[PDB]
Structure formats: C-alpha cells, structure tokens
Amino acid sequence: PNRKKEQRNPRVKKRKKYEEKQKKLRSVKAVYKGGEGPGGYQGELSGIKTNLVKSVKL
Amino acid sequence: KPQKKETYMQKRAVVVGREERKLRDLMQKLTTIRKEKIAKRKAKKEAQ
Amino acid sequence: GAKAGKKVIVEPHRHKGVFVARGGKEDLLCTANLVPGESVYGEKRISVETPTKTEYRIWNPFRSKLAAGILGGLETIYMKPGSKVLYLGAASGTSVSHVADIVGPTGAVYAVEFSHRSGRDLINMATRRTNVIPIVEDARKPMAYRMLVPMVDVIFADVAQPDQARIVGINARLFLKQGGGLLISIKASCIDSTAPPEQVFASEVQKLREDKFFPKEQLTLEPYERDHAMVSCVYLQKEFEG
Amino acid sequence: AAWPKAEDPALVQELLDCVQQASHYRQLKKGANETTKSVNRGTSELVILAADTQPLSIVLHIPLICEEKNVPYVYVPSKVALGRACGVSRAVIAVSLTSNEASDLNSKIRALRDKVERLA
Amino acid sequence: MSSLRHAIQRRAHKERAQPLERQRLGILEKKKDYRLRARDYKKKQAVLKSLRQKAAERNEDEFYFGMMSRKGPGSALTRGKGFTGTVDGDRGNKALSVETVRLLKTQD
Amino acid sequence: IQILGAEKALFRALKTKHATPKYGIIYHASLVGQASGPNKGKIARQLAAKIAL
Amino acid sequence: PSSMFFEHNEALVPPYNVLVDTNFLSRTVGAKLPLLESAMDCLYASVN
Amino acid sequence: ELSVRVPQLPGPPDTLSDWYNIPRTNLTPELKRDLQLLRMRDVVAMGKQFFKKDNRKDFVPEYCQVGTIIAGATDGVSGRLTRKERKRTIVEEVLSSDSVSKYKRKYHEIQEHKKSGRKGYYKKLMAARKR
C-alpha cells in the first residue's frame, strides 16, 4: 500500500506524534508556558467564567 | 397577514442616521457569522 | 492589549466583593477601590461615572496568588465584606490592598510583615486604607501581636518558609475562630526542592490535617505560576461559618 | 544594611561557581536593571548582589522587589569577583540567574537556595 | 477484511453527470438526491394524513374559550376572495385613543 | 425661557420624538421649588410666562 | 492533576509511597514474605 | 431635643449590599448592543483569539456598570488609546477597528452559501426550461 513520508522515517514520525500529543495536552489541562509577558498584564486574554469551580475537592 | 397599507406608527418613524446604520449593519454581519460558526461546531460535535 | 480608554462593563463575580470587568477582547478581574482616585502600585483602574467616587482596581493574577486562585476557580475564598482577615506574609502590601478592598470598611485586615522596608511600604498603604492595620513582626512568633489581633475569621498565608505549616498552625491556634477559613499558598520548590510537587502538596495537606485543619479544596494555579498550589481549609469543623 | 550577607566558609565560592555555570548555560542576567526586570517578570530563581558597591543603595533597592516576589537573595563581598565569575570584563554588582524546566544546573540552584534560605 | 484489499480495491467510483445536450433540464437526480426528495414528500404526506384524521374526527360541538377572542377561519362565502383556511392572527397593532394620538401628533 | 439651559435634552427629544424636558434653568429658582408633583411643571410654565413679561 | 501526561503519572519517583490493603497484608504474612524487603526487591527502590 | 417624628409609611433589590451597591441595569439599546457584542466576542476577533464558551439563555446580567480603564502608571506610550480612538461604546470601537472588510467578506461567503439553491436557483431553472 501507499504509506506516508512521515512513515518512511521513524524519528520524524515520533517527532510529529509528540508535537500533536503535547498539543492535545494543552486542550485538557493548563500548561504554564511563561508568566506575564514583557508587555505586562493585558487582561485574562481568553475569557473569565464565573460559575466554574476547578479545584480538586478533597 | 402581511399588512399592505402603511400605518401611522410606520409613517411617523424617525429616519435613522448613518452611524446607527453602520452599527446595525455590523451587528447583522456579526450575528450571521456567529450563527454559521455555531451550526458548524454543533455538526462536528454531533459527528463525534 | 487592555489599553487605557477602552470601555468595559463591570459585573459581579460569584464571590462577594470581587467583580469581573469584561469588554471587547479581554475580561479582567477587579475589586472596588476603598480610597478612590489613587492607585497603590501603578495598576490600571476602572472609573465609572454613576448616573466620580466609584472606581474599581484591576487584580493582577501574575502578581497575587489570591487572584491567581480565584481565576483558577476556588469554590470559596471565605472573605465576605465585613469579615476579619489575618494576612501572613504581607510583603509590601500589594495583594493586601485588594483583600482590604474586598472586606470593605466594616472589615479588618491584620497584615503581618517581617522585613522592615516592606514594613515601610505596608505602613504607607495602611495609612491610605483605614481597615488594614500593619504589624511588623515575625509570623513565627505570634505572641508578639496577641494584643493586636482579635479572633479573625479568615487567614491568608503567603509565606514562603519551610516551616510554613507550623507557622500557620500556631497562628491559627492563637487567632482563628471555631470553623475558621484559611487559604494557604504552597510553593513546592521552597517547601521541598528535591521532591515532586504533587507529593509536596500531599505532605503539606497531611501536616495541616495533623495541625487540626480539615482541608476542603485544592487547586494547582498552573497558567499563572509553576509548581504552586492553593489549599483551602476549615479550622476545627467541616462547615465554614457554623 | 546587608543582613543576609554570605560568610567565608565555601559559600561565596559555591555561589560564584554556580554563577559561572549558569553564565556558560546562558541562563543568567547581569547588572542591576536586568536583575530588576527578571525579578519583576518572575523568571528569577535566585539573585546574587555585590556588597562592595559604591553607595550601596542600588543593591539595597533590589531586595525590596525580591522580598515582594519571594525569591532568595544573597550578598557576595566583591563586585570585581562577581564580574570575573560572570565573564564580563566589567564589574557586576547584581546577578540574577533564572529558571528553566529542564537542566542539570537546577540541582545546584536548589541546593544553593536551600543554603540561602537557611542563611536568612 | 480491510487489510486484505488493495488501494485499487479501495479506489472510488466516480459519478457521471447529466449529458451536455440535456443540461438545461437541471441536475441528474441520483440515489442521494432521490432520497432527499422522497424524505421530504413522505414527511409532508405524513403531516397531511394526520391533519385529515384530525379534521375527520372533529366534534362539531366543541367549545374552547379562545373562540371568544379569536376570529374563525370562516368560509369562502363569509370571508370572501381573501379566504385562506388559516385563522388570522394579530400583528400587534391596536386602535389608538384620541388623547394618545394627540400626544403623538404634537411630537411629530 | 422655560427651557433655557435644558437644550441638549430638548433637541435630543425633539429629534427622536421623545418627550421634551419640562424646565431648564428655572428649576433652581425659589418659586418652582415649593411645588411637588405635576404642580412643579405647571408652576414652571406660569413662572416662565411671568418672567417673559 | 499536575504531573499527569495521558495516564502516565510523573509524580511517582522513588521513594515510592505504597498504600497497603488488608488482603495484601494478610497474604504477605501468609506467604512467609517480608513486607518492606520484598517491596524494595520488587521496585528496586526505597519505599515508604 | 425630642421632636415629633415624620411619618414615612407610604420586590427585587436595587443595589447589591454585598457587592458595594452595583446599580441594576438600565437596559438601554446601547448597553444591549454592548452585551450582544460581549457574547459574540469570539466572532469579533476572527479566530485570532478564542474565548470561554459562556452561553446562558439571557446574556444581560442583573447588575452591570459601564466603566473605562483609566491608566497604568508603568505603561503609557502604547498602552493608551489616543483621542481619535477613545470612542463612546464598545461597538463603536469594534467598528473603528480594522477587519470590518473581513466581516463583510465572511458575510458574503455565508450569503452565497445560503442563496446556493433556495429560490433564485429554481426561478433560473424554470426560465431555462420555458425558453
């Protein structure tokens, strides 16, 4: 069968699989990814939702 | 039934300005793009 | 960004005393300014002319671990307007101004700082706000300010010490009501720099439970600070007030 | 004026050796304004301040921001030695060495800031 | 199975179009478009069959209290040329008293 | 003279077919401040006419 | 929770915290088997 | 000393006592446009910045107050809107911003996709049959 240019090299495939599984991780949990930038605090740049409790209830 | 004569409350309506018509047109365009985006997201979630 | 002159609207948060000001491309968090018309540390503030004296001040989550925890989504922060708050680790009084702006004029914030130049900054901002009293003393020895602190309702603890749980344990044994709320901010790299942070957080929670607290919530405030946690616990009960 | 002063017995030289290691690893900011900007941006893990500074108010203004952000700070007694350890060809009076998520320098950073937190 | 088939086993079969000498009549309806047409017709006939059952099994002496605040569908004789079987609804307008029209005309 | 000073609300209301303001500068006189209710607007009318005279 | 990369717990590094159940404890006394020594010989690491 | 009292005897709250008296929403048409814009702020920044999907049935909250950012004393050269950009509402700022042509382009693509086969198409088919 016809296979992929990604599949002909086992390192480049495991590079692209890690880049997309590190990408799927940001959509579940929250990564740190640097604090405030050099510009300062431009607001919570993607929404603030008030009725959402995201703490592990001990 | 769609009314054919023009009522007095339609005759006495103020002609709206230019800035308010620009805001009205912008709100129309934003609401349509929002409705299309919501329908696409709901179709993708129903497929999943 | 959130430039000066943009129009925002200011709605109440789920918590009491905290508001969220949303507008355009950036929603931000704010508290009602106690002394209007002047910023403490050069923050952006929000003026609304009611149909003058009403101003709101923006609460930086990268600067203050309480606003980081509120944006993380704590279930409660225990400080309603009119509740006494003992702040431990009141370094220079930046977040203490926002806690005092939460608890309002009828509350009181007993801000304990140990260092002296941070004490100068704290005495300046407590000259401005008449409900925060400044206490320049070591938080490891709460016999120094037992004349000053009455039985408070909430303890905030933002000390970065390895003996943090013992400090908070003796301070809450001396100055906390039955069923007393507290929020402790744990920094894993300062508690145990070798151990993983989840194990450090579980060990600190277990030490609080040995020091008679009942922990009820815990969040790792991750997009604002690395390896930090905020643990909410109630002293000597299971419910908060009674 | 500099109360967390480092003492002689192999702590100043451990500090300057870790400083040189971080300067090779490119994880180090030199000079008072760069230390101030690194602490205010919060990336700082530890900050070394010279104590032989002509008038000391510079390395007195840095500990206020360090105490507000709760990062460790410590005074070494020679700005000439601090500049020689960094590799500058100028005397450096303030050095802040930052944090990265993956290194082997961070073990030296952690042991050093444990010793500094015991010094305070 | 699915691994026991080549790519030429997997290759799609294309659809023919309407002939170019006949393209003015519209698109050539294939099974998919026919399924859409049949679904719409079966749905409309199901609604019409339920409406015919409801019009057949109708009590001639029924009395709801909306009949004192609605105008009935009438007949072609009573209504006239403008007779649809639909009950006419209100557009929201109302006959307006003289004091309020005095106020509105002073404003105009 | 009844609605001198209330001209912004006046011309806003006249151009949008709202209801015009009842008084202007005249409101902070003495004699319209004793009334209460609709008698305030009635006394504003009568006082403005007497001011014109 | 932090230190969780897609069902891989990065929080567990030695010294391993091991919770013991009553079934495991009764059977590790029944099999003439020392508890901490066999746990250390299983994990090749210091357990608490 | 001690006077005759004034007798002053003749639903939902007006101001919140726990939130330092935020007044109830005077639901003006400009505030209604602003609130529609706030629930559609994902569409405004066209995919460059996505937002938390908060979708209640009523977008108008009970207590609001339209305010203005004053000033951060640390940043005042580029974190400050100029005089020809400090506008009255939020919708006026969105319209004075760029990418209004981008909104119009996306609207016309949606309009073509929705006029794709509805009734002008059938009028054209009927005319081509009748010719």
Coordinates of all heavy atoms in Angstrom, one line a residue, chain A, unseen atoms left out:
Chain A
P1 N 0.8 -1.2 0.0 CA 0.0 0.0 0.0 C 0.8 1.3 0.0 O 2.1 1.2 0.2 CB -0.8 -0.1 1.3 CG 0.0 -1.0 2.2 CD 0.6 -2.0 1.2
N2 N 0.2 2.4 -0.2 CA 0.9 3.7 -0.2 C 0.9 4.2 1.2 O -0.1 4.3 1.9 CB 0.1 4.7 -1.1 CG 0.8 4.7 -2.5 OD1 1.6 5.5 -2.8 ND2 0.3 3.8 -3.4
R3 N 2.1 4.5 1.7 CA 2.3 5.0 3.0 C 2.9 6.4 3.0 O 3.1 6.9 1.9 CB 3.2 4.0 3.8 CG 2.7 2.6 3.9 CD 3.6 1.7 4.7 NE 3.1 0.4 4.7 CZ 3.6 -0.6 4.0 NH1 4.6 -0.3 3.1 NH2 3.2 -1.8 4.0
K4 N 3.1 6.9 4.2 CA 3.4 8.4 4.2 C 4.9 8.6 4.3 O 5.7 7.8 4.8 CB 2.7 9.0 5.5 CG 1.2 8.7 5.5 CD 0.5 9.4 4.4 CE 0.5 10.9 4.6 NZ 0.1 11.2 6.0
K5 N 5.2 9.8 3.8 CA 6.6 10.4 4.1 C 6.9 10.5 5.5 O 8.1 10.4 5.9 CB 6.6 11.8 3.4 CG 8.0 12.4 3.3 CD 8.8 11.9 2.2 CE 10.2 12.5 2.2 NZ 10.2 14.0 2.3
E6 N 5.9 10.7 6.4 CA 6.2 10.6 7.8 C 6.5 9.2 8.3 O 7.2 9.0 9.2 CB 4.9 11.2 8.6
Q7 N 5.9 8.2 7.6 CA 6.1 6.8 8.0 C 7.4 6.2 7.5 O 7.8 5.2 7.9 CB 4.9 6.0 7.5 CG 4.5 4.9 8.5 CD 3.4 4.0 8.0 OE1 2.7 4.4 7.1 NE2 3.3 2.8 8.6
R8 N 8.0 6.9 6.5 CA 9.3 6.3 6.0 C 10.5 6.6 6.9 O 11.5 6.0 6.7 CB 9.6 6.8 4.6 CG 10.2 8.2 4.6 CD 10.4 8.7 3.2 NE 11.4 8.0 2.5 CZ 12.1 8.6 1.5 NH1 11.8 9.8 1.0 NH2 13.0 7.9 0.9
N9 N 10.3 7.5 7.9 CA 11.4 7.8 8.8 C 10.9 7.7 10.3 O 10.0 8.5 10.7 CB 11.9 9.2 8.6 CG 13.2 9.5 9.3 OD1 13.8 8.6 9.8 ND2 13.6 10.7 9.3
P10 N 11.4 6.8 11.1 CA 10.8 6.5 12.4 C 11.1 7.6 13.4 O 10.5 7.6 14.5 CB 11.4 5.2 12.8 CG 12.6 5.0 12.0 CD 12.4 5.7 10.7
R11 N 12.1 8.5 13.2 CA 12.3 9.6 14.1 C 11.3 10.7 13.9 O 10.7 11.3 14.8 CB 13.7 10.1 14.1 CG 13.9 11.3 14.9 CD 15.3 11.8 14.8 NE 15.8 12.0 13.4 CZ 15.6 13.0 12.7 NH1 15.0 14.1 13.1 NH2 16.0 13.1 11.4
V12 N 11.2 11.1 12.6 CA 10.3 12.2 12.2 C 8.8 11.9 12.5 O 8.1 12.8 12.9 CB 10.5 12.6 10.7 CG1 9.4 13.4 10.1 CG2 11.8 13.3 10.6
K13 N 8.5 10.7 12.4 CA 7.1 10.3 12.9 C 7.0 10.4 14.4 O 5.9 10.9 14.9 CB 6.8 8.8 12.5 CG 5.4 8.4 12.9 CD 5.2 7.0 12.3 CE 3.9 6.4 12.9 NZ 3.6 5.1 12.3
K14 N 8.0 10.1 15.1 CA 7.9 10.2 16.6 C 8.1 11.7 17.0 O 7.9 12.0 18.2 CB 8.9 9.3 17.3 CG 8.4 7.8 17.1 CD 9.3 6.9 17.8 CE 8.8 5.5 17.7 NZ 7.3 5.5 18.0
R15 N 8.6 12.5 16.1 CA 8.6 14.0 16.4 C 7.3 14.6 16.2 O 6.8 15.4 17.0 CB 9.6 14.6 15.5 CG 10.0 16.1 15.9 CD 9.2 17.1 15.2 NE 9.2 17.0 13.8 CZ 10.2 17.5 13.0 NH1 11.2 18.1 13.5 NH2 10.1 17.3 11.7
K16 N 6.6 14.2 15.2 CA 5.3 14.7 14.9 C 4.2 14.2 15.8 O 3.1 14.8 16.0 CB 4.9 14.5 13.4 CG 5.8 15.3 12.4 CD 5.4 14.9 11.0 CE 6.3 15.7 10.0 NZ 6.0 15.3 8.6
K17 N 4.4 12.9 16.3 CA 3.4 12.4 17.2 C 3.6 13.1 18.6 O 2.6 13.2 19.3 CB 3.6 10.9 17.3 CG 2.6 10.2 18.1 CD 2.9 8.7 18.2 CE 2.6 8.0 17.0 NZ 2.7 6.5 17.2
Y18 N 4.8 13.5 18.9 CA 4.9 14.2 20.2 C 4.5 15.6 20.1 O 4.0 16.1 21.1 CB 6.4 14.1 20.6 CG 6.6 14.8 22.0 CD1 6.1 14.2 23.1 CD2 7.3 16.0 22.1 CE1 6.3 14.8 24.3 CE2 7.5 16.6 23.3 CZ 7.0 16.0 24.4 OH 7.2 16.5 25.6
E19 N 4.6 16.2 19.0 CA 4.1 17.6 18.8 C 2.6 17.7 18.9 O 2.1 18.7 19.4 CB 4.6 18.2 17.5 CG 6.1 18.7 17.6 CD 6.5 19.4 16.3 OE1 5.7 19.3 15.3 OE2 7.6 19.9 16.2
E20 N 1.9 16.7 18.4 CA 0.5 16.7 18.4 C -0.1 16.1 19.7 O -1.2 16.3 20.0 CB -0.1 15.9 17.2 CG 0.1 14.4 17.3 CD -1.2 13.7 17.6 OE1 -2.3 14.3 17.5 OE2 -1.1 12.5 18.1
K21 N 0.7 15.3 20.5 CA 0.3 14.9 21.8 C 0.6 15.8 22.9 O 0.0 15.8 24.0 CB 0.8 13.5 22.1 CG 0.0 12.4 21.4 CD 0.4 11.0 22.1 CE -0.4 10.8 23.4 NZ -1.8 10.7 23.1
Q22 N 1.6 16.7 22.6 CA 1.8 17.8 23.5 C 0.8 18.9 23.2 O 0.5 19.7 24.1 CB 3.2 18.4 23.4 CG 3.8 19.0 24.6 CD 5.0 19.9 24.3 OE1 5.6 19.8 23.2 NE2 5.3 20.8 25.2
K23 N 0.2 18.9 22.0 CA -0.8 19.9 21.7 C -2.2 19.4 22.2 O -3.0 20.3 22.6 CB -0.9 20.0 20.1 CG -2.0 20.9 19.6 CD -1.8 21.0 18.1 CE -2.3 19.7 17.4 NZ -3.8 19.6 17.5
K24 N -2.4 18.1 22.3 CA -3.7 17.6 22.9 C -3.7 17.8 24.4 O -4.7 17.8 25.0 CB -3.8 16.1 22.5 CG -4.3 15.9 21.1 CD -4.5 14.4 20.8 CE -4.9 14.2 19.4 NZ -5.1 12.7 19.1
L25 N -2.5 17.9 25.0 CA -2.4 18.1 26.4 C -2.8 19.5 26.8 O -3.4 19.7 27.9 CB -1.0 17.8 26.9 CG -0.8 17.7 28.4 CD1 -1.3 16.3 28.8 CD2 0.7 17.9 28.7
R26 N -2.5 20.5 26.0 CA -2.9 21.9 26.3 C -4.4 22.0 26.3 O -5.0 23.0 26.9 CB -2.3 22.9 25.4 CG -0.8 22.8 25.4 CD -0.2 23.9 24.5 NE 1.2 23.7 24.1 CZ 1.5 23.3 22.9 NH1 0.6 23.1 22.0 NH2 2.8 23.1 22.6
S27 N -5.1 21.2 25.5 CA -6.6 21.3 25.4 C -7.3 20.6 26.6 O -8.5 20.6 26.6 CB -7.0 20.7 24.1 OG -6.9 19.3 24.0
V28 N -6.5 19.9 27.4 CA -7.2 19.2 28.6 C -6.8 20.0 29.8 O -7.6 20.5 30.5 CB -6.7 17.7 28.6 CG1 -7.4 17.1 29.8 CG2 -7.1 17.0 27.4
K29 N -5.5 20.0 30.2 CA -5.0 20.7 31.3 C -4.5 22.0 30.9 O -4.8 22.5 29.8 CB -3.9 19.9 32.0 CG -2.7 19.6 31.2 CD -1.8 18.6 31.8 CE -1.2 19.1 33.1 NZ 0.0 18.3 33.5
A30 N -3.8 22.7 31.8 CA -3.3 24.1 31.6 C -1.8 24.0 31.8 O -1.3 23.6 32.8 CB -3.9 25.1 32.5
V31 N -1.0 24.4 30.8 CA 0.4 24.4 30.9 C 0.8 25.8 31.4 O 0.0 26.8 31.3 CB 1.0 24.1 29.5 CG1 0.8 25.2 28.5 CG2 2.5 23.7 29.6
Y32 N 2.0 25.9 31.9 CA 2.5 27.2 32.4 C 2.8 28.2 31.3 O 2.2 29.2 31.2 CB 3.7 27.0 33.3 CG 4.3 28.3 33.8 CD1 3.5 29.2 34.5 CD2 5.7 28.5 33.7 CE1 4.1 30.4 34.9 CE2 6.2 29.7 34.2 CZ 5.4 30.6 34.8 OH 6.0 31.8 35.2
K33 N 3.8 27.8 30.4 CA 4.1 28.5 29.2 C 4.5 29.9 29.4 O 4.0 30.8 28.7 CB 2.9 28.4 28.2 CG 3.4 28.3 26.7 CD 3.9 26.9 26.4 CE 4.4 26.9 24.9 NZ 5.5 25.9 24.8
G34 N 5.4 30.2 30.4 CA 5.8 31.6 30.6 C 4.7 32.3 31.4 O 3.5 32.1 31.3
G35 N 5.2 33.3 32.3 CA 4.3 34.0 33.1 C 3.7 35.2 32.4 O 3.2 35.0 31.2
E36 N 3.7 36.4 33.0 CA 3.3 37.6 32.3 C 4.4 37.9 31.3 O 5.6 37.7 31.5 CB 3.2 38.7 33.2
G37 N 4.0 38.4 30.1 CA 4.9 38.7 29.1 C 5.7 39.9 29.4 O 5.6 40.5 30.4
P38 N 6.6 40.4 28.4 CA 7.3 41.7 28.6 C 6.3 42.9 28.5 O 6.6 43.9 29.1 CB 8.3 41.7 27.4 CG 8.4 40.2 27.1 CD 7.1 39.6 27.3
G39 N 5.2 42.7 27.9 CA 4.2 43.8 27.8 C 3.5 44.1 29.1 O 2.9 45.2 29.3
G40 N 3.4 43.1 30.0 CA 2.7 43.3 31.2 C 1.5 42.5 31.3 O 1.5 41.3 30.8
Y41 N 0.4 43.0 31.9 CA -0.8 42.2 32.1 C -1.9 42.9 31.2 O -2.4 44.0 31.5 CB -1.3 42.2 33.5 CG -2.5 41.4 33.7 CD1 -2.6 40.1 33.3 CD2 -3.7 42.0 34.2 CE1 -3.7 39.3 33.5 CE2 -4.8 41.2 34.4 CZ -4.8 39.9 34.0 OH -6.0 39.2 34.1
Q42 N -2.2 42.2 30.1 CA -3.2 42.7 29.1 C -4.6 42.1 29.4 O -5.4 42.0 28.5 CB -2.7 42.4 27.7 CG -1.2 42.4 27.5 CD -0.8 41.8 26.2 OE1 -1.6 41.3 25.4 NE2 0.5 42.0 25.9
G43 N -4.9 41.7 30.6 CA -6.1 41.1 31.0 C -6.0 39.6 30.8 O -5.1 39.0 30.1
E44 N -6.9 38.8 31.4 CA -7.1 37.4 31.1 C -7.6 37.3 29.7 O -8.8 37.5 29.4 CB -8.0 36.8 32.1
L45 N -6.7 36.9 28.8 CA -6.9 37.2 27.4 C -8.0 36.3 26.7 O -8.4 36.7 25.6 CB -5.6 37.0 26.6 CG -5.3 37.9 25.4 CD1 -5.4 39.4 25.8 CD2 -3.9 37.6 24.9
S46 N -8.4 35.2 27.3 CA -9.4 34.4 26.8 C -10.4 34.1 27.9 O -10.4 33.1 28.4 CB -8.8 33.1 26.2 OG -8.5 32.2 27.3
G47 N -11.3 35.1 28.1 CA -12.5 34.9 28.9 C -12.2 34.8 30.4 O -11.1 34.4 30.9
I48 N -13.2 35.1 31.2 CA -13.3 34.7 32.6 C -14.7 34.2 32.9 O -15.7 34.9 32.6 CB -13.0 35.9 33.6 CG1 -11.5 36.1 33.6 CG2 -13.4 35.6 35.0 CD1 -11.1 37.3 34.5
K49 N -14.8 32.9 33.3 CA -16.0 32.3 33.6 C -16.2 32.2 35.1 O -15.4 31.6 35.8 CB -16.1 30.9 32.9 CG -17.4 30.3 32.9 CD -17.3 29.0 32.3 CE -17.4 29.1 30.8 NZ -18.8 28.8 30.3
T50 N -17.3 32.7 35.6 CA -17.5 32.8 37.0 C -18.1 31.6 37.7 O -17.7 31.4 38.8 CB -18.5 34.0 37.3 OG1 -19.8 33.6 37.0 CG2 -18.1 35.2 36.3
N51 N -18.9 30.8 37.0 CA -19.6 29.7 37.7 C -18.9 28.4 37.5 O -19.5 27.4 37.4 CB -21.0 29.6 37.1 CG -21.1 29.4 35.6 OD1 -20.1 29.6 34.9 ND2 -22.2 28.8 35.2
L52 N -17.6 28.4 37.4 CA -16.8 27.2 37.1 C -15.8 27.0 38.3 O -15.0 27.9 38.5 CB -16.1 27.4 35.8 CG -15.7 26.1 35.1 CD1 -17.0 25.3 34.8 CD2 -15.0 26.5 33.8
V53 N -16.0 25.9 39.0 CA -15.1 25.5 40.1 C -14.2 24.4 39.6 O -14.6 23.3 39.3 CB -15.9 25.1 41.3 CG1 -15.0 24.5 42.3 CG2 -16.6 26.3 41.9
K54 N -12.9 24.7 39.6 CA -11.9 23.8 39.0 C -10.9 23.4 40.1 O -9.7 23.4 39.8 CB -11.2 24.4 37.8 CG -12.0 24.4 36.5 CD -11.1 24.5 35.3 CE -10.6 25.9 35.2 NZ -11.8 26.8 34.9
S55 N -11.3 23.0 41.2 CA -10.5 22.6 42.3 C -10.8 21.2 42.7 O -11.9 20.8 42.7 CB -10.6 23.5 43.6 OG -11.9 23.3 44.1
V56 N -9.7 20.4 43.0 CA -9.9 19.0 43.4 C -10.5 19.0 44.8 O -9.8 19.3 45.8 CB -8.6 18.3 43.4 CG1 -8.8 16.9 43.9 CG2 -8.0 18.3 42.0
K57 N -11.8 18.7 44.9 CA -12.5 18.7 46.2 C -12.0 17.5 47.1 O -12.3 16.4 46.8 CB -14.0 18.6 46.0 CG -14.8 18.5 47.3 CD -16.2 18.8 47.0 CE -16.8 17.9 46.0 NZ -16.6 16.4 46.3
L58 N -11.2 17.8 48.1 CA -10.6 16.8 49.0 C -11.7 16.3 49.9 O -11.7 16.5 51.1 CB -9.5 17.4 49.8 CG -8.1 17.3 49.4 CD1 -7.8 18.1 48.1 CD2 -7.1 17.7 50.4

